[PDB]
Scaffold this active site. Structure first.
Site, PDB file in Angstrom:
ATOM      1  N   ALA A 148      60.069  60.738  21.331  1.00 41.03           N
ATOM      2  CA  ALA A 148      58.705  60.655  21.909  1.00 41.03           C
ATOM      3  C   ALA A 148      58.559  59.292  22.600  1.00 41.03           C
ATOM      4  CB  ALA A 148      57.666  60.953  20.839  1.00 41.03           C
TER       5      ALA A 148
ATOM      6  N   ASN B 262      50.405  56.042  15.068  1.00 41.68           N
ATOM      7  CA  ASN B 262      49.478  55.978  13.935  1.00 41.68           C
ATOM      8  C   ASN B 262      50.008  55.058  12.837  1.00 41.68           C
ATOM      9  OD1 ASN B 262      47.425  57.908  14.907  1.00 41.68           O
ATOM     10  ND2 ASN B 262      49.101  59.392  14.706  1.00 41.68           N
TER      11      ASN B 262
ATOM     12  N   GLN C 243      58.366  56.386  21.075  1.00 41.11           N
ATOM     13  CA  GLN C 243      58.569  55.405  20.013  1.00 41.11           C
ATOM     14  C   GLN C 243      59.405  54.207  20.467  1.00 41.11           C
ATOM     15  OE1 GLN C 243      60.082  57.987  16.905  1.00 41.11           O
ATOM     16  NE2 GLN C 243      58.219  59.229  17.010  1.00 41.11           N
TER      17      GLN C 243
ATOM     18  N   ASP D 162      43.668  67.069  24.342  1.00 39.10           N
ATOM     19  CA  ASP D 162      44.984  66.489  24.150  1.00 39.10           C
ATOM     20  C   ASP D 162      45.722  66.335  25.472  1.00 39.10           C
ATOM     21  OD1 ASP D 162      47.978  66.518  23.270  1.00 39.10           O
ATOM     22  OD2 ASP D 162      46.854  66.350  21.374  1.00 39.10           O
TER      23      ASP D 162
ATOM     24  N   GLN E  80      49.498  55.976   2.278  1.00 36.93           N
ATOM     25  CA  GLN E  80      50.142  54.938   3.081  1.00 36.93           C
ATOM     26  C   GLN E  80      49.217  53.749   3.318  1.00 36.93           C
ATOM     27  OE1 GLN E  80      53.181  55.705   6.037  1.00 36.93           O
ATOM     28  NE2 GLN E  80      51.862  54.852   7.645  1.00 36.93           N
TER      29      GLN E  80
ATOM     30  N   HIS F   4      48.301  64.043  16.161  1.00 39.72           N
ATOM     31  CA  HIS F   4      47.194  64.149  17.102  1.00 39.72           C
ATOM     32  C   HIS F   4      45.929  64.652  16.452  1.00 39.72           C
ATOM     33  CE1 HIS F   4      49.466  64.038  21.131  1.00 39.72           C
ATOM     34  NE2 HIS F   4      50.301  63.647  20.185  1.00 39.72           N
TER      35      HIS F   4
ATOM     36  N   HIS G 259      59.111  54.534  11.834  1.00 38.71           N
ATOM     37  CA  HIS G 259      59.694  55.144  13.023  1.00 38.71           C
ATOM     38  C   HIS G 259      58.959  54.779  14.307  1.00 38.71           C
ATOM     39  CE1 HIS G 259      56.861  58.875  13.228  1.00 38.71           C
ATOM     40  NE2 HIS G 259      56.255  57.852  12.647  1.00 38.71           N
TER      41      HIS G 259
HETATM   42  O1  LIG Z   1      53.808  59.982   2.940  1.00 37.25           O
HETATM   43  C1  LIG Z   1      53.082  59.840   3.874  1.00 37.25           C
HETATM   44  C2  LIG Z   1      53.589  60.009   5.266  1.00 37.25           C
HETATM   45  C3  LIG Z   1      52.675  59.823   6.423  1.00 37.25           C
HETATM   46  N1  LIG Z   1      51.285  59.477   6.199  1.00 37.25           N
HETATM   47  C4  LIG Z   1      50.312  59.299   7.325  1.00 37.25           C
HETATM   48  O2  LIG Z   1      50.652  60.061   8.319  1.00 37.25           O
HETATM   49  C5  LIG Z   1      50.552  59.176   9.654  1.00 37.25           C
HETATM   50  C6  LIG Z   1      51.955  58.989  10.216  1.00 37.25           C
HETATM   51  O3  LIG Z   1      51.750  58.806  11.604  1.00 37.25           O
HETATM   52  P1  LIG Z   1      53.067  58.458  12.537  1.00 37.25           P
HETATM   53  O4  LIG Z   1      52.542  57.977  13.868  1.00 37.25           O
HETATM   54  O5  LIG Z   1      53.970  57.436  11.888  1.00 37.25           O
HETATM   55  O6  LIG Z   1      53.968  59.864  12.653  1.00 37.25           O
HETATM   56  P2  LIG Z   1      53.398  61.066  13.639  1.00 37.25           P
HETATM   57  O7  LIG Z   1      51.892  60.997  13.509  1.00 37.25           O
HETATM   58  O8  LIG Z   1      53.913  62.414  13.240  1.00 37.25           O
HETATM   59  O9  LIG Z   1      53.842  60.620  15.178  1.00 37.25           O
HETATM   60  C7  LIG Z   1      53.703  61.513  16.201  1.00 37.25           C
HETATM   61  O10 LIG Z   1      52.326  61.385  16.768  1.00 37.25           O
HETATM   62  C8  LIG Z   1      52.042  60.024  17.269  1.00 37.25           C
HETATM   63  C9  LIG Z   1      50.696  60.024  17.958  1.00 37.25           C
HETATM   64  O11 LIG Z   1      50.876  60.476  19.283  1.00 37.25           O
HETATM   65  C10 LIG Z   1      53.124  59.526  18.227  1.00 37.25           C
HETATM   66  O12 LIG Z   1      52.895  58.140  18.556  1.00 37.25           O
HETATM   67  C11 LIG Z   1      54.494  59.700  17.616  1.00 37.25           C
HETATM   68  O13 LIG Z   1      55.528  59.336  18.555  1.00 37.25           O
HETATM   69  C12 LIG Z   1      54.738  61.106  17.225  1.00 37.25           C
HETATM   70  F1  LIG Z   1      55.992  61.172  16.598  1.00 37.25           F
HETATM   71  C13 LIG Z   1      50.023  58.027   9.350  1.00 37.25           C
HETATM   72  O14 LIG Z   1      48.542  58.079   9.590  1.00 37.25           O
HETATM   73  C14 LIG Z   1      50.245  57.856   7.842  1.00 37.25           C
HETATM   74  O15 LIG Z   1      49.146  57.233   7.313  1.00 37.25           O
HETATM   75  C15 LIG Z   1      50.767  59.313   4.814  1.00 37.25           C
HETATM   76  O16 LIG Z   1      49.627  59.041   4.659  1.00 37.25           O
HETATM   77  N2  LIG Z   1      51.688  59.496   3.649  1.00 37.25           N
END
Ligand SMILES: O=c1ccn([C@@H]2O[C@H](COP(=O)(O)OP(=O)(O)O[C@H]3O[C@H](CO)[C@@H](O)[C@H](O)[C@H]3F)[C@@H](O)[C@H]2O)c(=O)[nH]1
Ligand SMILES: [K+]
Length: 447
Positions: free
Chosen positions: A356, A337, A358, A112, A318, A14, A333
């Site tokens: 979440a 993002n 997903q 948020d 990434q 977020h 997953h």
């Molecule tokens: O080795 C790495 C590992 C990750 N990243 C970066 O971190 C981001 C991963 O985002 P992602 O949506 O897959 O996981 P997360 O943000 O924790 O999801 C939660 O937040 C989301 C937003 O609400 C939600 O949809 C989800 O269900 C939640 F679990 C993404 O922008 C990648 O570019 C990286 O650059 N190098």
């Protein structure tokens, strides 16, 4: 000058998109302030490196809720106990928020989804509040339809399929894909939190959504019409901004390497990693695998696949990887993002939802967008039990299907189409550019 205050929850997924929204506003000559906490400020400071984004630090009451002093981030609150403590803690930020709003009197509060009370907090000073969720229109809609119609109660077994009501696509799901705190042992805390989150979308001034209209037009419309929300689609916001593994990939065929990464915060146990490694070896595909050694790797693995397979243990670049010509697929997953980054790079995905929203994102990717393949995971759970590990066979099947399987080149074509649409949505004149302009003009005109 217009002043907008941004208040994301302390979670990487977020915070980063909230920063991108702040940058988008700043580039339109809007003053943008982001509220964070001391142990999280480094994330924004690093990503700031152009107009000035201001930071405001709140004290997080970890001790008052029984959290370790060092736990100021959702990712570190592991377990139901710690997570409920974390949400009590963030609810206790209300007083600092109302003090800061009285002091600064900004023109808008972007808060948020996890802060429904922020609406009232801003109303005390006649300030409009916008909700930011950080997910797709589709997940917003499907979550609200499931909450309202509860189609999981017309079901006798864990894997019995039901359709999602009202939707213009037939989407079949099972109650295993829903949190057990909703369909099995109803715990009133999460149910009430969800009720208040979804209600804030109508009680507030409106919703900012990190998506673009052309990606999911049916659900961009469903959210506004059938569900009654006022919304603006301004995504993907990460396009505002726009190496060892890269030099590795340079000597590879176009669209031949699989990228595996499970998000910013990965709770992943050794048996699961071991199954993934065995499946990767059996698949024969070249790969970049991002991991959080004989405790999870087969003997001689890293040497036996050298030149073909690469394991990254740190934080991987990434976006640069996904948009490199050599990368053809993405085991993810289905966090929004990462999903959006896959779409923007035009890269098809193996979907491996965990918790979440997903599983809704997985349905959007596979059945509606038609750019992905399920790995077969279908159990919603915060932590993974050894009893739930996905075995190497399914992983290998998905890795094969995504690269040379049926429709793989069509998925690449569809994803490149979505990629062009994504880049066009945010350019001057695009849907997202225009919706942001419209939102800012509406904020200028408030009262
Ligand atoms: O080795 C790495 C590992 C990750 N990243 C970066 O971190 C981001 C991963 O985002 P992602 O949506 O897959 O996981 P997360 O943000 O924790 O999801 C939660 O937040 C989301 C937003 O609400 C939600 O949809 C989800 O269900 C939640 F679990 C993404 O922008 C990648 O570019 C990286 O650059 N190098
Ligand atoms: K309605």
């Amino acid at each position: 000058q217009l002043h907008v205050v941004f208040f994301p929850i302390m979670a990487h997924g977020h915070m980063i998109p909230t920063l991108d929204i702040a940058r988008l506003f700043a580039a339109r000559n809007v003053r943008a302030t982001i509220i964070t906490t001391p142990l999280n400020a480094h994330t924004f400071t690093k990503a700031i490196e152009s107009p000035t984004i201001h930071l405001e630090l709140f004290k997080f009451p970890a001790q008052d809720v029984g959290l370790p002093e060092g736990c100021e981030n959702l990712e570190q609150a592991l377990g139901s106990s710690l997570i409920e403590k974390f949400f009590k803690g963030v609810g206790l930020l209300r007083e600092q928020l109302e003090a800061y709003l009285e002091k600064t009197r900004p023109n808008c509060l972007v808060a948020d989804m996890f802060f429904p009370w922020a609406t009232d907090s801003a109303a005390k000073f006649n300030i409009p509040r916008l909700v930011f969720h950080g997910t797709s229109f589709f997940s917003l809609c499907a979550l609200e339809v499931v909450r309202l119609y509860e189609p999981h109660k017309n079901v006798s077994s864990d894997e019995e399929l039901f359709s999602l009501p009202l939707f213009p696509h037939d989407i079949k799901m099972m109650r295993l894909q829903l949190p057990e705190d909703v369909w099995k042992h109803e715990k009133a805390e999460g149910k009430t939190r969800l009720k208040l989150i979804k209600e804030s979308e109508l009680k507030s001034y409106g919703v900012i959504v990190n998506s673009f209209y052309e990606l999911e037009p049916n659900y961009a419309e469903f959210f506004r019409k059938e569900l009654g929300r006022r919304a603006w689609n301004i995504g993907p916001v990460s396009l505002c901004n726009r190496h060892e593994c890269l030099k590795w990939l340079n000597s590879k065929k176009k669209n031949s390497v699989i990228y595996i990464c499970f998000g910013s915060t990965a709770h992943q146990i050794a048996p699961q990693l071991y199954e993934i490694a065995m499946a990767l070896e059996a698949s024969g595909q070249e790969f970049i695998w991002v991991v959080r050694d004989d405790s999870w790797l087969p003997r001689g693995f890293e040497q036996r696949v050298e030149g073909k397979g690469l394991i990254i243990r740190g934080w991987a670049p990434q976006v640069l990887i996904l948009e490199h010509e050599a990368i053809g697929a993405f085991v993810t997953h289905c966090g929004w993002n990462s999903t959006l980054e896959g779409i923007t790079a035009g890269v098809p995905m193996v979907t491996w939802p965990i918790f979440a929203e997903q599983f809704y994102n997985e349905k959007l990717v596979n059945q509606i967008l038609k750019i992905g393949v399920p790995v077969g995971a279908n159990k919603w759970s915060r932590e993974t039990s050894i009893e739930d590990v996905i075995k190497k066979d399914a992983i290998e099947k998905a890795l094969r299907e995504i690269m040379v399987g049926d429709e793989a080149e069509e998925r690449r074509s569809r994803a490149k189409k979505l990629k062009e649409m994504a880049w066009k949505a945010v350019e001057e004149g695009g849907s997202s550019y225009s919706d942001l302009s419209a939102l800012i003009e509406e904020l200028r005109g408030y009262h």
